[PDB]
Design a protein around this ligand. Structure first.
Ligand SMILES: O=C(O)[C@H]1O[C@H](O[C@@H]2[C@H](O)[C@@H](O)[C@@H](O[C@@H]3[C@H](O)[C@@H](O)[C@@H](O[C@@H]4[C@H](O)[C@@H](O)[C@@H](O[C@@H]5[C@H](O)[C@@H](O)[C@H](O)O[C@@H]5C(=O)O)O[C@@H]4C(=O)O)O[C@@H]3C(=O)O)O[C@@H]2C(=O)O)[C@H](O)[C@@H](O)[C@H]1O
Length: 542
């Protein structure tokens, strides 16, 4: 029984991931990772060998949504209460005077000492990339502290409000500037700036300001949310409609001397590595490569489709921008013969099977850029876009992904010649989410019946030792796993209470810094993502 499984799972998290380091006076905070076999919590190793237990609240915002949803569907308020208590504790102890939290890519809390940590000593800064925190919960606990965070986030990460120069990181302890009252002057596409306007952090700026508007009716927040979203639309290629991952280019401060030194101070990294053969259109924002296209055509799309709907009449432009881009990506990059996307430049250039002729930001010389399989995160974004605009081009991508993923044939159109694979072994929570989206818009029973099968596969093959794991051999389970989130969304659908579970935007957290190896050496740019990929007996490789 799915709801019973999720309740048992969250009970297990609150037992095994809890603060066991302060006797009978524990904090409410949780460890990000737990070995489900032993209960060992995942640790970060600092240069002197001190071990901290990783508690990064930005990497727990799927769990927070799971706990809220579990309380809604079960009627047991203890999970909502604990999620609220964790939020309250972070505002009480881990929010600096500027409003920023000790979370994100380069800050976390040590569950043993309850001190904020900074694992990247050259980077003791605030960083959110495709995080999408559960601000709805935070506002219900403390609306002023949540608003202070969102304003402080923009205050630290907007380097120049006149031109909307943004940055993926921000400093703590900054005084508040003019914020939404700042004067703005729109600049031409790909103006040169120091700050890096990557859309993974831009996603979090747009989303947070939109939630501040939703909760506090802050019209300045909404104006700048829409303006920042527009910054990623204005530079899109005039002919293809593709792009963009960023809307500025790196300000060239020094002449480069080595291809393999990719510091942004030497200028746009794509223009260095691709400029000689491809010309001026080779800019970082225009590189439609694996990963970048997930941030653009999945994470940004999920958030903007939901925001566009929420805004009603004044969200129509946002919906058009978002769907137009997904159409362009399908038209140029999708290969329906083998369910791949072509690596591309946004001017329409195909980079399939291109061999890199020099070292650079996008790979060593000799690297071959290959078409890459379209994963289930794109099944979600194409399903949701089709619900808004019933375009057969969008359906073709959804149908190709589902077929490639072993789900069968979702039909030539919703409900037309459906032949789904009810014996599928697929256990991907992303596929479950996408099938619920196809079902919600079409009301075709077979899509939810297939979603039930995926849910049963998730329980059968990923519910292991009381936790959810991507493989039975993984060393650590992630308490932010989205398997239980998909299961709750399925239960909410079956119970005719879809609003019981927060909309899935595919956010996640990460932690990055130097990590100490057993020989005492420093492994720079280590990520907790890497720790969660280890199997039993495996260690991080240099
Ligand atoms: O595998 C993937 O594709 C990867 O894609 C995303 O991540 C990419 C990239 O892979 C990440 O490494 C990261 O890169 C950022 C910059 O592009 C990179 O050059 C590096 O930048 C550092 C500093 O972070 C940056 O602030 C600049 O710093 C200046 C100076 O060098 C520094 O010493 C000084 O203190 O501050 C200066 C300044 O403020 O300008 O430039 C530095 C440099 O070396 O150039 O690191 C950046 C970073 O950590 O954000 O993010 C990329 C991204 O697209 O976000 C994806 O997020 C990954 O998950 C993965 O998929």
């Amino acid at each position: 029984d799915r709801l019973t499984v999720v309740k048992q799972y969250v009970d297990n998290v609150l037992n095994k991931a809890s603060d066991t380091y302060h006797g009978d006076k524990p904090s409410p905070l949780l460890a990000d990772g737990v070995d489900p076999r032993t209960g060992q919590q995942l640790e970060w190793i600092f240069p002197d060998g001190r071990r901290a237990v990783l508690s990064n609240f930005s990497a727990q915002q799927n769990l927070m949504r799971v706990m809220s949803g579990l309380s809604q569907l079960s009627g047991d308020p203890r999970y909502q209460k604990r999620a609220e208590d964790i939020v309250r504790y972070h505002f009480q102890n881990y929010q600096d005077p500027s409003g920023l939290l000790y979370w994100g890519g380069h800050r976390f809390v040590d569950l043993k000492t309850l001190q904020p940590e900074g694992p990247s000593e050259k980077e003791r800064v605030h960083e959110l990339k495709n995080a999408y925190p559960y601000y709805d919960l935070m506002f219900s606990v403390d609306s002023d502290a949540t608003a202070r965070f969102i304003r402080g986030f923009w205050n630290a990460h907007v380097y120049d409000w006149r031109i909307l120069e943004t940055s993926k990181h921000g400093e703590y302890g900054k005084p508040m500037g003019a914020l939404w009252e700042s004067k703005f002057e729109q600049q031409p596409p790909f103006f040169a700036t120091k700050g890096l306007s990557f859309l993974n952090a831009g996603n979090d700026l747009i989303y947070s300001a939109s939630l501040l508007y939703q909760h506090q009716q802050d019209q300045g927040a909404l104006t700048w949310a829409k303006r920042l979203a527009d910054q990623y639309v204005l530079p899109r290629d005039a002919k293809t409609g593709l792009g963009v991952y960023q809307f500025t280019q790196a300000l060239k401060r020094e002449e480069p001397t080595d291809d393999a030194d990719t510091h942004s101070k030497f200028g746009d990294r794509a223009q260095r590595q691709f400029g000689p053969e491809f010309g001026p259109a080779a800019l970082e924002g225009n590189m439609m490569l694996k990963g970048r296209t997930s941030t653009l055509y999945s994470e940004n799309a999920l958030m903007q489709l939901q925001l566009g709907k929420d805004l009603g009449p004044q969200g129509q432009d946002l919906l058009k921008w978002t769907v137009d881009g997904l159409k362009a990506f399908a038209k140029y990059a999708y290969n329906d013969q083998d369910n791949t996307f072509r690596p591309m430049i946004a001017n329409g250039q195909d980079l399939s099977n291109y061999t890199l002729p020099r070292d650079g930001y996008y790979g060593k010389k000799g690297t071959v850029l290959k078409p890459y399989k379209a994963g289930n995160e794109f099944l979600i974004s194409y399903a949701r876009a089709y619900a808004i605009d019933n375009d057969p081009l969008l359906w073709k991508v959804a149908r190709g992904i589902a077929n490639d993923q072993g789900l069968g044939d979702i039909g030539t159109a919703p409900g037309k010649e459906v032949k789904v694979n009810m014996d599928t072994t697929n256990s991907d929570p992303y596929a479950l989410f996408a099938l619920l989206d196809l079902y919600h818009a079409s009301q075709v029973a077979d899509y939810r019946k297939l979603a039930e099968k995926i849910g049963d596969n998730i329980i059968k093959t990923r519910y292991i030792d009381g936790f959810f794991m991507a493989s039975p051999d993984r060393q650590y389970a992630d308490v932010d796993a989205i398997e239980p989130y998909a299961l709750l969304a399925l239960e909410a659908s079956l119970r005719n209470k879809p609003q019981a579970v927060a909309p899935f935007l595919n956010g996640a957290g990460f932690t990055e810094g130097a990590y100490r190896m057993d020989d005492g050496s420093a492994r720079v740019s280590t990520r907790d993502n890497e720790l969660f990929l280890l199997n039993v007996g495996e260690k991080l490789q240099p």
